[PDB]
Amino acid sequence: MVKKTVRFGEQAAVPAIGLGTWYMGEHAAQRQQEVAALRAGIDHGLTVIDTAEMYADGGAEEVVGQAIRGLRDRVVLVSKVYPWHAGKAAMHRACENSLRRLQTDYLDMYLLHWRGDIPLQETVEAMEKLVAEGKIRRWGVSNLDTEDMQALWRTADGEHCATNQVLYHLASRGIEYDLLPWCQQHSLPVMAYCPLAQAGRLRDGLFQHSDIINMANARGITVAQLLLAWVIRHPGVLAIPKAASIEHVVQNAAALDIVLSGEELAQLDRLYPPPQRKTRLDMV
Ligand SMILES: NC(=O)C1=CN([C@@H]2O[C@H](COP(=O)(O)OP(=O)(O)OC[C@H]3O[C@@H](n4cnc5c(N)ncnc54)[C@H](OP(=O)(O)O)[C@@H]3O)[C@@H](O)[C@H]2O)C=CC1
């Protein structure tokens, strides 16, 4: 079967499952383990690594930095800037600091982490300057709903936006009503974060559901793998699960090979139905 890829920035076809790093860089005795988890993912064909300045207050970025040493040409590196750093007075410095901790001279992609009080115009000019200087190849956003994206498109050069990173998983389908359709209409890939719902922390009976467990068992796959396949069932969606466990990384990479039937998806629609209303943008 055809490989599941996404056009992402300057990269024409990245694999549709990448590597999250939230809660890496926190525990300094787990450094080497985290490096190996990232390295196993790259080994198994995943290229997109997603981090941020927020994550363990620079720690995640440092871990990713050691992990990608000698492998910069193998990875598609995405980081992010706090809304309060996303204007003239702090953009260059926050990027410079991310880059230093990553031990690299460029990002493939830089995302506004979420929307704050800096006018979008200012943020876009700041990003375009980083592009011009070669610090980032492309820029994008995170945690923007349909209305924020429309506001971004009304901004000069705001259509250069490369992705929108938003929460999406089986038990939180809100983006399906209006956001994913808008994104498809403008050829904008979505990065899906918490694609496993934090291994069921964000939904009490998700991982423990009866039908789900049996649907996984019949395929010989795990629940997490079933939920990943679900996220990337349609094109233009790049899931970024986090896995500091090698066993989990390898499984996540194998989720790329899973094509769920029309029967199975309708059953999942009965258990976790799509939205019938403009729902507010879910975030963690
Ligand atoms: N833009 C934003 O505001 C935000 C962006 N993000 C990004 O999205 C990424 C993903 O979101 P996140 O919050 O980490 O949650 P996820 O849905 O990715 O779940 C992560 C959890 O799932 C576990 N896990 C991973 N793979 C498996 C598997 N195959 N089987 C069983 N358990 C598994 C992990 O355990 P273990 O590590 O021990 O394997 C961890 O506890 C983050 O790492 C970050 O890069 C996240 C939140 C906010």
Q: Determination technique for this PDB entry?
A: X-ray
Cα separation, 10 vs 95, whole angstroms: 19
Question: How far apart are alpha carbons 123 and 160 in whole angstroms?
Answer: 12
Is 195:241 a contact under the CB 8 Å cutoff?
yes
Q: Can you count the helices (H) and strands (E) in the chain?
A: 11, 10
Mutate to test the pocket of ligand 1, among 196, 222, 238 (most ligand atoms within 8 A of CB): 196
Active site (catalytic) residues: 55
Neighbours of 178 (CB within 10 A): 17
Q: Which amino acid is at 37?
A: A
Q: How many CB atoms lie within 10 A of CB 213?
A: 13
The helix, strand and coil proportions of the chain, stated in percent and rounded to the nearest 5, come to 45, 15, 40
Look at ligand 1, atom 43, and give the residue with the nearest C-alpha: 20
**220 to 12, 22, 63, 196, 215: CA distances (angstroms):** 32, 29, 33, 18, 9
Maximum Cα–Cα distance for the chain, whole Å? 55
Amino acid at site 45: G
Ligand 1 atom at minimum distance from 199 CA: 22
In angstroms, what is the C-alpha Rg of the chain?
18
Closest approach atom of ligand 1 to CA 244: 37
Q: How many domains does the chain have?
A: 1
- 52/31 Cα distance (integer angstroms): 17
Q: How many angstroms is it from 194 CA to the middle of ligand 1?
A: 5
Query: Domain residues for 144?
Result: 1-284
271: domain CATH number? 3.20.20.100
